[PDB]
Design a protein around this ligand. Sequence first.
Ligand SMILES: CC(=O)N[C@@H]1[C@@H](O)[C@H](O[C@@H]2O[C@H](CO)[C@@H](O[C@@H]3O[C@H](CO)[C@@H](O[C@@H]4O[C@H](CO)[C@@H](O[C@@H]5O[C@H](CO)[C@@H](O[C@@H]6O[C@H](CO)[C@@H](O)[C@H](O)[C@H]6NC(C)=O)[C@H](O)[C@H]5NC(C)=O)[C@H](O)[C@H]4NC(C)=O)[C@H](O)[C@H]3NC(C)=O)[C@H](O)[C@H]2NC(C)=O)[C@@H](CO)O[C@@H]1O
Ligand SMILES: CC(=O)N[C@@H]1[C@@H](O)[C@H](O[C@@H]2O[C@H](CO)[C@@H](O[C@@H]3O[C@H](CO)[C@@H](O[C@@H]4O[C@H](CO)[C@@H](O[C@@H]5O[C@H](CO)[C@@H](O[C@@H]6O[C@H](CO)[C@@H](O)[C@H](O)[C@H]6NC(C)=O)[C@H](O)[C@H]5NC(C)=O)[C@H](O)[C@H]4NC(C)=O)[C@H](O)[C@H]3NC(C)=O)[C@H](O)[C@H]2NC(C)=O)[C@@H](CO)O[C@H]1O
Length: 99
Amino acid sequence: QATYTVAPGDTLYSIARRYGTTVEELMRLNGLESFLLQPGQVLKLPSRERTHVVAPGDTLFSLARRYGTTVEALMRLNGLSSPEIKVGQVLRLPEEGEA
Ligand SMILES: CC(=O)N[C@@H]1[C@@H](O)[C@H](O[C@@H]2O[C@H](CO)[C@@H](O[C@@H]3O[C@H](CO)[C@@H](O[C@@H]4O[C@H](CO)[C@@H](O[C@@H]5O[C@H](CO)[C@@H](O[C@@H]6O[C@H](CO)[C@@H](O)[C@H](O)[C@H]6NC(C)=O)[C@H](O)[C@H]5NC(C)=O)[C@H](O)[C@H]4NC(C)=O)[C@H](O)[C@H]3NC(C)=O)[C@H](O)[C@H]2NC(C)=O)[C@@H](CO)O[C@@H]1O
Ligand SMILES: CC(=O)N[C@@H]1[C@@H](O)[C@H](O[C@@H]2O[C@H](CO)[C@@H](O[C@@H]3O[C@H](CO)[C@@H](O[C@@H]4O[C@H](CO)[C@@H](O[C@@H]5O[C@H](CO)[C@@H](O[C@@H]6O[C@H](CO)[C@@H](O)[C@H](O)[C@H]6NC(C)=O)[C@H](O)[C@H]5NC(C)=O)[C@H](O)[C@H]4NC(C)=O)[C@H](O)[C@H]3NC(C)=O)[C@H](O)[C@H]2NC(C)=O)[C@@H](CO)O[C@H]1O
């Protein structure tokens, strides 16, 4: 069970984007009803997601932001020959140490 300790200025959103998860998942996992956090608060983190099925409207930029990584990592991991992507494509996502 990975955790993250809240620092001044952190929000559920900024933490979610850094770790490649969502506000709703952080709240579900930690039983939160409020966006109010205090420095020192320990938050349980979800496991890294392993794959994403590409949907209409997705782009490598947007998926890099969603999963806390980079276009470059997503391209390398999936052997992509250009920065464009296809509906239905299954993209492998980075592990914690390589995002
Ligand atoms: C490089 C580039 O340009 N990239 C862009 C992408 O960035 C862009 O994606 C969009 O990006 C937007 C900007 O990041 C984003 O908008 C933001 O959305 C989030 C989520 O809805 C908003 O988050 C809320 O922010 C408020 C403050 O504005 C937070 O309130 C603060 O909460 C803290 C923590 O609890 C609290 O601090 C505590 O305060 C008490 C005293 O009251 C103190 O005792 C405690 O010690 C203290 N705690 C700590 C830990 O410090 C603080 O008081 C309040 N503040 C106030 C004033 O009350 C909310 O908690 C927070 N919500 C959540 C759920 O986290 C944020 O405000 C939005 N910013 C803006 C500018 O709108 C977009 O959502 C995002 N969109 C997408 C689709 O991703 C994309 C797309 O355009 O384009 C490029 O890629
Ligand atoms: C038709 C159409 O599609 N139009 C498009 C249009 O929507 C697009 O414009 C964009 O719209 C979106 C969605 O509206 C905008 O995104 C929103 O942005 C705002 C501002 O950043 C966010 O507002 C914050 O919302 C949070 C909740 O999510 C608020 O937090 C809550 O605050 C209340 C009030 O204090 C708290 O209630 C109090 O709670 C205490 C207990 O703590 C209780 O004792 C009190 O009684 C209680 N008080 C009351 C009065 O009830 C409450 O607890 C707290 N919630 C939590 C969980 O802690 C926060 O205060 C809001 N911030 C501000 C500031 O007001 C909003 O979340 C966000 N929504 C989304 C979905 O992101 C977006 O900004 C906007 N963009 C632009 C450019 O305009 C446009 C363009 O995209 O396109 C059109 O087509």
